[PDB]
């Protein structure tokens, strides 16, 4: 019983702690505005909009 011991994330981040310095860091954190709505404005205007 220790935080449900099954290391598969911390060990991976420690083994690959340095593989990208200034390559990206722009399409990972600022990628929440690329395609916001692509299917949310077409599901409520077919059957729900008729009634």
């Amino acid at each position: 019983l220790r935080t449900k011991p099954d290391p598969e994330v911390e060990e991976q981040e420690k083994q690959l702690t340095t593989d990208a310095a200034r390559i990206g860091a722009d399409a990972a954190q600022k990628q929440i505005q690329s395609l916001n709505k692509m299917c949310s404005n077409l599901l409520e205007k077919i059957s729900k909009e008729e009634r």
Partner: protein, 105 residues
């Protein structure tokens, strides 16, 4: 062939790119090529497939109680095969007459 062609088209369009469109937003991995796939095959294909399915659903619904869409069920198609049998018997008789004629040589 109308209903057959409609079913064939529905089958060919059943496997739309909507199921494969789950890798379109990750195409922006070069700047903050094929980005057009995130527009035409994102939801419009699924919408069109659903519309076609709904249209196909609302048909005449002919079959109500018993056995409609019949059409053979009956007469001398049997006698057509019987006439083919008569043709075969005439063939056999002609062959026998030809054998008799050959023996007459």
């Amino acid at each position: 062939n109308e209903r057959l062609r409609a079913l064939e088209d529905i089958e060919r369009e059943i496997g739309a790119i909507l199921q494969n469109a789950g890798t379109v937003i990750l195409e922006l991995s070069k700047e903050k090529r094929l980005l057009d796939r995130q527009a035409a095959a994102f939801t419009a294909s699924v919408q069109h497939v659903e519309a076609e399915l709904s249209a196909q659903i609302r048909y005449l619904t002919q079959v109500a109680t018993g056995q409609p869409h019949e059409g053979s069920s009956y007469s001398s198609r049997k006698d057509c095969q019987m006439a083919l049998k008569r043709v075969d018997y005439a063939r056999l008789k002609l062959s026998d007459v030809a054998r008799t004629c050959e023996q007459m040589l």
